From a paper:
Each of IiPLR1_NAP_ + PIN/AtPrR1_NAP_ + PIN/AtPrR2_NAP_ + PIN forms a homodimer, and superimposition of the protomers among the three complexes revealed RMSDs of 0.374, 0.365, and 0.308 Å, respectively. In contrast to IiPLR1_NAP_ + PIN, the β4 loops of AtPrR1_NAP_ + PIN and AtPrR2_NAP_ + PIN can be clearly identified. These well-defined loops twist as an “8” shape and cover both the NADP+-binding and substrate-binding grooves. Within the twisted loop, His93 and His97 “grasp” helices α5 and α10, while Val92 and Phe94 interact directly with (+)-pinoresinol; Arg95 strongly interacts with NADP+ as well as each of the GXXGXXG motif and α2-helix from neighboring protomer of the dimer. Similar conformational changes of β2 loop and α10-helix can be seen by comparing the structure of AtPrR1_NAP_ + PIN with that of AtPrR1_NAP and the structure of AtPrR2_NAP_ + PIN with that of AtPrR2_apo. Furthermore, Leu46 (corresponding to Val46 in IiPLR1), His276 and Phe277 of AtPrR1 are positioned similar to the corresponding residues of IiPLR1 to effect substrate binding or product release, except that the β4 loops cover the substrate/product, which are disordered in the IiPLR1 structures. Besides the β4 loop, Val46 in IiPLR1 is replaced with Leu46 in AtPrR1, which has the effect of compressing the substrate-binding pocket. Therefore, the entrance and orientation of the substrate in AtPrR1/2 is more tightly controlled than in IiPLR1.
Author numbering:
A (entry chain C), B (entry chain D): 9 to 317
């Protein structure tokens, strides 16, 4: 039985990873930091994990020895640390976890908080969006310096942030009548239900095929252009949307004057929808999660969008 | 089937009320406000409501006619508006809901956001905690000046904020070794699991017995002193905790110099555990929810506390 520590267990993807580890059959440990005082939602999340059979491990990122103690309990550590500018962007805090793993020496694999664009492929991104890739690379740098075996889970847009809103920024719901199309809207993007991301993570974390590998989440039916995604919704609703095509220069105009979390968002959307960073390179079946784990009947984006009807 | 609208549907008690209305068989509507921007957890709560069978109603408190349109759809309106200083304390925003109910004319009953201490009994309270009772009384006044029929649900401490922490402030977990006892710890308090509070709400909101009444949530097995609460925990754990008795004037010492949310917390705790405001007066079976709805097998605190072992 694989023992797994989830660090970031109440996070957006972290909580889905916890439940996926439990359903996969792993002996699932969750790190509970003691600073969560009156954050009642976090406290009841941990209590719901307990009721599912998770085991709470108390530890703190400012107590190096408590991290060492926690990781010594498990075979695999999965980190879901924050990495979104408008939420919180504390990627580099994992360095203390890496150090703790380095000292414990028992850890057979570490999955750091990746779950998005492929960091080493983003060397061209400009600040502040660039921070995400620079800081994940630095965590990668520490992992491989320490000789810690790893798996990097990358390659898909969370469906909540990019599909349920027809990729409109600052909203999470489909628009009623108007939609902005990025460029011609013919650039292929990779989408995935976050619950499937979690299930692929639970399955890959002890799979020899993915030891010391980048694993890509690129389910073939979910490779869609923005216009394809829009047209799915128009078909489901029986209503055409008025589409405005936004050229690259107008999308980025005056970016330097906007608040930093919005600058990052714009930078990321530009890589995804204008440069097509998630599909501008091919990946093999031996490094792609839908083909590695074909028993995951992943949710297609028409079924994902139906939830919004 | 009673048609119910919940305003505050993603709130702490609000989401529990939505689910209990659905389980009770009400045709349940929930107000989705448009300023839900990137608050993904709210967005996904509504999706979870829809799948359980709730109907989404769009409206904004800054758009009076949207509110009138919403309350027109239902027979009863339940408000779970915020009212905790360290969370947010927007009780007075319900005045706009009351005004829309007035104009609509069809609402058979309105339950405002109370769910705690009985406001008219708290006239002696001092600021800032006093604001809770004053604003809840201003809402009561506007309800009655509009002729809207009502039910006021009051009388119990939410289990998570007062029982699961053995009533220690700024924490939501049982303490590991040491516990503060307020006074002698022999002042009776009322505790209720918040899912039972929601079930009673769902059961009372169309009950002829409770039209234009105050309904008290005072389950007899859950009327306990703080020492009795601590004794339940100590028998669950087999370990005695070290108890420190805190006298009134030491509990309140230098209260004027602390943050306003903490001041309000101390004021509330003083009224509950030093004055006994939840038990310094009696209520008939006619107006108490556990006798009113005896098929609700309310969770006793020993079972509640087991979630924390
Ligand atoms: N479309 C995509 O592909 C997306 C990719 N991502 C990536 O997913 C990963 C997770 O992001 P997300 O789920 O939104 O993150 P969250 O913002 O939900 O944060 C996750 C966890 O971060 C922990 N955390 C935050 N700050 C600290 C801190 N100072 N010290 C210790 N722990 C801290 C918390 O642990 P705890 O549970 O202990 O409190 C928190 O729950 C990130 O790398 C992100 O970049 C995320 C959004 C979209
Ligand atoms: N022990 C006890 O007896 C306790 C009693 N209470 C009482 O419970 C009741 C609800 O409190 P609680 O669950 O903590 O509420 P929350 O703090 O969870 O807020 C509940 C809802 O208030 C709505 N809200 C907040 N601000 C606004 C605003 N400006 N405009 C429109 N809507 C707003 C939101 O509705 P939306 O979902 O639509 O976003 C939110 O989800 C209160 O009267 C409180 O005093 C609370 C805790 C303990
Ligand atoms: C797709 O890969 C990533 C996606 C993201 C997204 O986390 C979600 C964000 C972010 C920028 O895309 C969300 C975003 C930021 C700004 C917005 O206005 C927004 O609107 C939906 C959404 C972060 C890191 C990634 O490697
Ligand atoms: C019991 O009646 C009420 C309780 C409350 C509680 O919502 C919860 C609060 C508040 C003050 O008691 C929670 C409180 C505030 C400060 C704290 O430090 C705290 O620690 C657990 C908890 C609000 C209104 C009420 O009428």
């Amino acid at each position: 039985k694989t023992r797994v520590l989830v660090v970031g267990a109440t996070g957006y993807i972290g909580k889905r990873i916890v439940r996926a580890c439990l359903a996969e059959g792993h002996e699932t440990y969750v790190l509970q930091r003691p600073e969560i005082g009156l954050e009642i939602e976090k406290v009841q999340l941990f209590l719901s994990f307990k009721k599912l059979g998770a085991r709470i491990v108390e530890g703190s990122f400012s107590d190096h020895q408590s991290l060492v103690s926690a990781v010594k309990l498990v075979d695999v550590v999965v980190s879901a640390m924050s990495g979104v500018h408008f939420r919180s962007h504390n990627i580099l805090v994992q360095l203390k976890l890496v150090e703790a793993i380095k000292e414990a020496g028992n850890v057979k694999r570490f999955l750091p908080s990746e779950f998005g664009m492929d960091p080493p492929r983003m060397g061209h991104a400009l600040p502040p969006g660039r921070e995400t890739f620079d800081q994940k690379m630095e965590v990668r740098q520490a992992i491989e310096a320490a000789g810690i075996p790893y798996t990097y889970v990358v390659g898909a847009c969370f469906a909540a942030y990019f599909a349920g809103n027809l990729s409109q920024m600052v909203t999470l719901l489909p628009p009623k009548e108007k939609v902005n199309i990025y460029g011609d809207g013919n650039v292929k993007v990779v989408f995935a239900d976050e619950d499937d991301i979690a299930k692929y993570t639970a399955k890959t974390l002890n799979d020899p095929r993915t030891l010391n590998k980048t694993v890509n989440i690129r389910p073939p039916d979910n490779v869609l252009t923005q216009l394809e995604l829009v047209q799915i919704w128009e078909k489901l609703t029986g209503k055409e949307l008025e589409k405005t095509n936004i050229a690259a220069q107008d999308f980025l105009a005056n970016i330097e004057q906007m608040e930093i979390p919005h600058q990052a968002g714009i930078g990321h959307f530009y890589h995804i929808f204008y440069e097509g960073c998630l599909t501008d390179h091919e990946v093999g079946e031996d490094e792609e999660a839908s083909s590695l784990y074909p028993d995951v009947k992943y949710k297609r984006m028409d079924d994902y969008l139906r939830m919004f009807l």
